[PDB]
Design a protein around this ligand. Structure first.
Ligand code: GDE
Ligand code: GDE
Ligand code: FE2
Ligand code: FE2
Lengths: 409, 411
């Protein structure tokens, strides 16, 4: 519930490559890693419990279904295979409870979201995190990733990215736990990596952008995609993600550190911001925002025999739901019927999860967090009509359930 | 550019079952199919060019990544395998041009979207569509699907679905083409298909909801998920999709038809709404809306050597982007290096597309509609540094291009 501050850093994959190759005293790379140092120190000293991490996926985990604001709600994240195998880094833990609270708040404020679990984080995340945080066996903090669809136009306007951050601030502050949260905005600065214009940079615009983001961020909010692409290059226009992070910080921040280097394609820049707290009370109190974020499902627990599929339940039921979802694949479902045990022994299912499936325990799976539409698939594959499932839910014989209907179908 | 009207219809998979199992003379189902006939007849007579189709996917094509408003921008859609194999139905054609226009207007109005291509439509689409439209060889109209994330809470508020509809109305009207567009809201009405409460229905609420939706829809906009699940069953609360559709129509509509049947788990309902056009001119003219939708990329064409990855480009490059995306799979990329010609023959790639990859024609791929991030994967798989790709883009040798860099470095 306390925002300690925020940081901005480029996420170009070269940072990771330079790290993995130990170019720490290379004449080109030495002052660059030195640029990351104050951010690295601040993080080790401040010890945030969670980093809210704003990034974009580079057509790896997001392609055929490509969303604007994709909130990671899952228990943990591994490095994505980008075509060269997964980087050797430990998984980083997520925060389902914080992510759900944020989703509730952001939807109440009429932002439209996507929710995701299980997919890998590409270089947009693990390039800068691997240089910012020590990771021998695990990571020093949890993450809540926000993957932003900045690559397929139209994308949200600059002012929308900013307004998301403003609502995000209130969301994090109203979270009823005494934790410390840092916000990260990544990508940028100037660059262009496609077409005959590949290699464009604008150091002059970069410095201006940094200054304005720090000290007058509102003056950036009228910039169009054309403006940002003209000034910073096509891919450099991803800096709207910095705006989102900056919007989540206090209107006035202190700049603890800032650096800038351009050795090759991308302006590798870093900024560190110390949150100053609120200069005045927010328009709506923490207690009031909490009540408002809960109003949609207020009193839902008074509906008996009902198990609303909320984010917490989706996380709880994720392994078993993911498993049953695979029944839409011809080979998997053939195996489910002929050799279920061989399929179980290969899975990551708990013994209890296997047991629920083997027993065809319909109501138990619902209690546990399986969504009905996965059971529907399971029933179909096993030759079991939906009527059987409903009868089990109700504790009735098939005919006695059928009696509650107007016609037996 | 002309909204002729809209229909509301249940999407329960049981409609497809009865249809496929040929049940038009069965005593239970015959009257039900007769309930669909006024909507079927109106579609056949009115001949919309496109139906804007509002539905939800039932954890089939949308699961690990689950979005609120998922707009289908692609060229065609096939039935999804839902665990029983693909229903035997032909592909239905999309409308990428109208989809792109709609996206531009909606983002300008600050709705946050998802774009998708190539994935199957589950029963949410093909159940009612198969009874409403003839399809033995092909479909009579195009579709623009909008898959709504109604299953994983928090979901957008009722008023948000309605405001989406209001903005969608203007988006379709301002589309500079002389076409007829029908709007479909699907799902509902009362039902609950999970838990000890499974089997719940509420016919009185169903009728009142429909009457209010037809004649006073703004009286519904303060309904919470709890209100809607209490009155209509947990899954019955998806009727916010009906609201979105209703939001897209004239403030006054003529309700040509209403039917209602409850044989089993789901209140099977139909409504046909004739659009009454606009009583007064819109708050913002069509001309002004077109310009505002275009103002984010206004003047981007002045930027040389640049190829904005817009929806039209994402559609054009879809097959080749999708192919090169698969390089993230260990088995596919080993095959790419070891037997590319074999991989090509099994693919759906046109010869133009295969040739581009075969020649490692980097700039030609960018011109074609391949996004750089797919070429980055291809380069890496073949052991080529990004530096060679960039030099190829600039029409320079590696050494020549390196000179433009402050430091000539390796990666
Ligand atoms: O090859 C590079 O320097 C490079 C590759 C990327 O994918 C990227 O996003 C970037 O900013 C730079
Ligand atoms: O077995 C059923 O009647 C059934 C199954 C579904 O997946 C569904 O959405 C529905 O409204 C009814
Ligand atoms: Fe990026
Ligand atoms: Fe549905």
């Amino acid at each position: 519930a306390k925002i300690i501050g925020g940081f901005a850093v480029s996420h170009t994959p070269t940072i990771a490559f330079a790290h993995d190759a130990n170019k720490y005293d290379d004449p080109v790379w030495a002052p660059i890693f030195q640029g990351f140092e104050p951010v690295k120190q601040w993080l080790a000293e401040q010890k945030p419990d969670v980093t809210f991490y704003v990034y974009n996926d580079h057509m790896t985990s997001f392609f055929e279904h490509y969303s604007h604001f994709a909130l990671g709600v899952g228990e943990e994240y591994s490095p994505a295979d980008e075509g060269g195998g997964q980087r050797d880094l430990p998984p980083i833990k997520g925060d389902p409870e914080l992510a759900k609270h944020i989703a509730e708040c952001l939807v109440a404020d009429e932002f439209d979201l996507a929710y995701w679990q299980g997919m890998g984080l590409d270089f947009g995340a693990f390039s800068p995190l691997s240089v910012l945080l020590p990771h021998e066996h695990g990571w020093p903090c949890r993450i809540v990733p926000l993957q932003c669809g900045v690559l397929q136009h139209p994308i949200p306007k600059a002012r929308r990215f900013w307004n998301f951050g403003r609502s995000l601030r209130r969301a994090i502050q109203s979270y009823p736990r005494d934790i410390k949260v840092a916000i990260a905005g990544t990508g940028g600065l100037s660059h262009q990596v496609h077409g005959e214009r590949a290699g464009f940079n604008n150091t002059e615009w970069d410095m201006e952008f940094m200054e304005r983001l720090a000290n007058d961020p509102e003056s950036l909010l009228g910039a169009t995609v054309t403006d940002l692409a003209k000034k910073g290059g096509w891919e450099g226009a991803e800096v709207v993600m910095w705006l989102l992070m900056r919007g989540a910080l206090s209107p006035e921040v202190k700049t603890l550190h800032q650096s800038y280097f351009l050795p090759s394609m991308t302006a590798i820049a870093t900024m560190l911001f110390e949150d100053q707290g609120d200069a005045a009370p927010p328009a709506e109190s923490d207690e009031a925002l909490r009540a408002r974020a809960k109003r949609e499902l207020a009193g839902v627990e008074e509906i008996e025999g009902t198990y609303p599929f909320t984010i917490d339940r989706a996380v709880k039921g994720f392994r078993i739901n993911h498993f049953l979802h695979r029944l839409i694949e011809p080979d998997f479902r053939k195996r489910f019927v002929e050799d279920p045990e061989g399929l179980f022994a290969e899975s990551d299912l708990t013994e209890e999860e296997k047991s629920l499936i083997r027993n065809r325990d319909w109501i138990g799976m619902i209690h546990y967090g399986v969504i009905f539409f996965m059971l529907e698939k399971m029933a179909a594959v096993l030759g079991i009509g939906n009527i059987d499932v409903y009868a089990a839910f109700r504790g009735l014989s098939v005919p006695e359930f059928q009696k509650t209907r107007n016609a037996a179908i």
